[PDB]
DNA sequence: CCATTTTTCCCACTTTCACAACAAAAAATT
DNA sequence: TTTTTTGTTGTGAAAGTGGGAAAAATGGAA
């Protein structure tokens, strides 16, 4: 089924079947795997693929754009949240009544736009329970997290939020598992500012100044540096209510206007009146 | 070649049976000797078996080995010794890769930032050129080439293969690296064609990036567009344009780039200031 | 401690692999 | 006309593949 696109790409390379032949590899197979009538092992694809420079993440996006189960779910609620239908957005949690995590997370984002509908307390205690299972965060319990975490109570949303700076999945060509990581400990540092657990902050910016480094995620940076200096206002230093109005700048500067008028209107409402 | 051991300690870590993954494609036992260096699996089966533990692709197979390509075993390497600043070692890994053209032509591109003797003979890159003419869809290999080896390509033929790069290259609506490559390498071609005031080639970059940047954050390649973008309407008579030339060099000052700072306030202060 | 779940070990039986010889088209020698 | 270069079939040999019985692991009762 992959095949066509093995043979898709490899003549749009312009390279012969048996370039690719190895001792991993008989050119046979080749041959037939690229019409549909054999399949390979999948550590000999991956050297096909090694071969041509083609990504296993290029190749299998390349062939279809029906994603994993996961993204169908966000592409999907996405889908109706930026339209607000709420009828369409029912339909979904009909279909995954039987995935427990998947179908916490669509009242979660339910209630956003429609407050009657919110996750029992028992349904978030079962997806954080999960959360506190995984040795090793992915994608997956990421996005979870982050679209169920205003019904996680605090305390349990920092030990979630450390467990997932501590040990998340790495990797120097994907950053945006490291991104989307880097922006859910700000969103967890703002509360724990407002609630001033302020141990808690301080581990926290120390893992998002860690995070940013060697990295050009300018909006992380721009919203650590308003937030960090909110921060260091209530805590005695003059430069923090600068780094708040340089911040605002940069939101005015790239013509980002729904998050300058957010920003500017937290800003005067906590700084002057 | 290995890959049901780190395929156990992903499925392990989630607490998850095997037989959850078992179903109408896949054995629930095959599952247990892939696992254990015996058997090996069909790929499509893989995908299957990571597609209900909800594990892309992406992170299995960079959570079994990281420099598993023979690409990034290679750029791993080159940003290693290149962040020590030795030569030594680099032009140790040039003589490692004799026996591959682009990549040791690439090397060499890197490796005359930091030291001048050794540069891409006009052959190699020519040859580099002509392979990415030949490229029908451009991946994160083709993308890296070209951005790495911009500095020896001479501009026409750089305009060109940042055309065909924009207008065919492959991206993920869930892993964009190859979308923010193309837009930052045709944010640098958009820069060099105001230096020549190309302003067709200008104009025909500025749309394809304003296209690129829509529905996406990409704060760093809004401010240096903010600058290039700029640049080019002060040569269009403009002075509109200075002001988003320094509101970006600010931008690089609040937020602490002190390399990018002094390497765009250095063009600003060439072409504006004399 | 035992009930239960989970994984490994043991049976036929299907598919795949590599060494082939196979035809066709390109490239080269007439 | 020839070779040479590329790709599509056939056939012992050796894997991959599913169901089930052992072995093991796991998780609470007394």
Request: with cysteine.
């Amino acid at each position: 089924e992959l095949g066509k696109t093995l043979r898709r790409l490899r003549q749009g390379k312009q390279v012969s079947i048996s370039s690719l032949a190895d001792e991993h590899l008989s050119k046979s197979q080749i041959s037939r795997f690229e019409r549909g009538e054999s399949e390979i092992s999948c550590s000999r694809l991956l050297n096909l693929l090694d071969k041509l420079n083609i990504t296993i993440d290029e190749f299998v996006s390349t062939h279809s754009k029906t994603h994993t189960h996961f993204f169908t779910l966000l592409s999907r609620v996405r889908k109706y949240y930026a339209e607000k239908n709420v009828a369409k957005l029912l339909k979904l949690l009909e279909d995954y009544a039987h995935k427990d995590y998947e179908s916490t997370m669509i009242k979660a984002i339910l209630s956003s736009i429609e407050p009657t509908v919110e996750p029992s307390e028992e349904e978030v205690t079962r997806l954080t329970d999960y959360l506190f299972s995984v040795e090793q965060w992915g994608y997956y319990e990421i996005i979870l997290l982050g679209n169920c975490s205003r019904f996680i109570n605090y305390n349990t949303l920092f030990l979630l939020t450390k467990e997932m700076v501590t040990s998340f999945a790495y990797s120097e060509q994907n950053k945006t598992n490291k991104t989307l990581v880097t922006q859910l400990s700000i969103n967890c540092l703002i509360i724990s500012i407002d609630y001033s657990y302020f141990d808690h902050s301080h581990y926290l910016i120390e893992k998002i100044e860690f995070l940013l480094r060697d990295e050009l995620n300018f909006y992380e940076k721009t919203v650590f540096l308003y937030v960090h200096g909110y921060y260091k206002l209530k805590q005695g230093q003059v430069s923090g209510k600068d780094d708040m109005r340089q911040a605002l700048q940069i939101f005015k500067y790239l013509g980002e206007d729904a998050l300058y008028y957010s920003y500017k209107e937290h800003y005067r409402k906590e700084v002057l009146g």
